[PDB]
């Protein structure tokens, strides 16, 4: 009861402010100094914008978890219930598009130059935004505060017998499997291609052992590891309930607060992963600071 309101809001707010740390740092270093050299910065700052919007949406739920009432009315309740979902799906599709673009660049060097341009970059960014919107369509059409006493949540038109579990499994399947497996395929294919290219060209180059090649391997595997360990708990601990109502427990609301903050930890790490741990971004980061 009380210890929850003591610890959970603190960690929620600290996660939000560290995510905003990353987002603001990246967005500043991008818009100011490293301004539009190719599709890469476009995708990176798009992901940063999605994550920053997610962070700014966080405080609403962070305070609701402690107040247990939404006195702002249906307007902001539904607005934020849709904004959080669209931001989540946009941040995920941004990583997906980044992986796809890196795959095309490393494998199809030819078509790459043909398709990688700034207009196409902005076009695919807008497409990712509208796709996040069209995939969160269920989240926004089911959004309603009146269907409940105080909790600002969604309205499931029918019992959880075949809808709650159904919608949960649908959103989990899409968000986790599609983006994650696409990213993993892209990265492991990039690794296979670079390995095949290097082994055929002076393998004793000495970078294969503990350098750029291994740095790339470590980064691409850490991407998948972080994405999994952060997202999978969210979509997993949500289904453990609709199949078996957990007896109301402070530990269970914790269990959930944790699995709902884990995606925010992913949105916080994404800036760290891409902006900080990269080349020609870290250059400006070190130059200005």
């Amino acid at each position: 009861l009380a210890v929850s309101g003591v610890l959970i809001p603190l960690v929620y707010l600290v996660v939000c402010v560290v995510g905003l740390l990353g987002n603001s740092l990246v967005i500043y270093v991008v818009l100011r100094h490293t301004a539009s050299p190719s599709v890469t910065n476009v995708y990176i700052l798009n992901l940063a914008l999605a994550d920053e919007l997610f962070m700014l949406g966080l405080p609403f739920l962070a305070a609701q978890n402690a107040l247990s009432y939404w006195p702002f009315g249906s307007l902001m309740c539904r607005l934020v219930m849709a904004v959080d979902g669209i931001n989540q799906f946009t941040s995920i599709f941004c990583l997906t598009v980044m992986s796809v673009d890196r795959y095309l660049a490393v494998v199809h060097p030819t078509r790459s130059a043909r398709w990688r341009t700034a207009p196409v970059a902005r076009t695919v960014s807008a497409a990712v935004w509208v796709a996040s919107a069209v995939v969160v369509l269920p989240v926004v059409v089911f959004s309603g505060v009146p269907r409940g006493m105080s909790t600002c949540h969604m309205q499931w038109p029918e019992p959880a017998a075949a809808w709650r579990a159904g919608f949960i499994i649908y959103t989990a399947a899409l968000g986790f499997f599609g983006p994650l497996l696409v990213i993993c395929l892209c990265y492991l294919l990039i690794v296979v291609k670079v390995r095949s290219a290097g082994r055929r060209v002076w393998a004793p180059s000495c970078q294969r052992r503990r350098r750029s090649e291994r740095r790339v391997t470590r980064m691409v595997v850490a991407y998948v590891a972080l994405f999994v360990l952060c997202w999978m708990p969210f979509y997993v601990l949500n289904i453990v309930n609709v199949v078996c109502p957990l007896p109301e427990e402070p530990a269970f609301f914790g269990l959930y607060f944790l699995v709902v903050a884990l995606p925010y930890a992913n949105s916080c790490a994404n800036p760290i992963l891409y902006g900080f741990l990269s080349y020609r971004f870290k250059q400006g980061f070190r130059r200005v600071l």
Partner: peptide
């Protein structure tokens, strides 16, 4: 249900 414990 969703981002709330139920």
């Amino acid at each position: 249900x969703x981002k709330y414990f139920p």
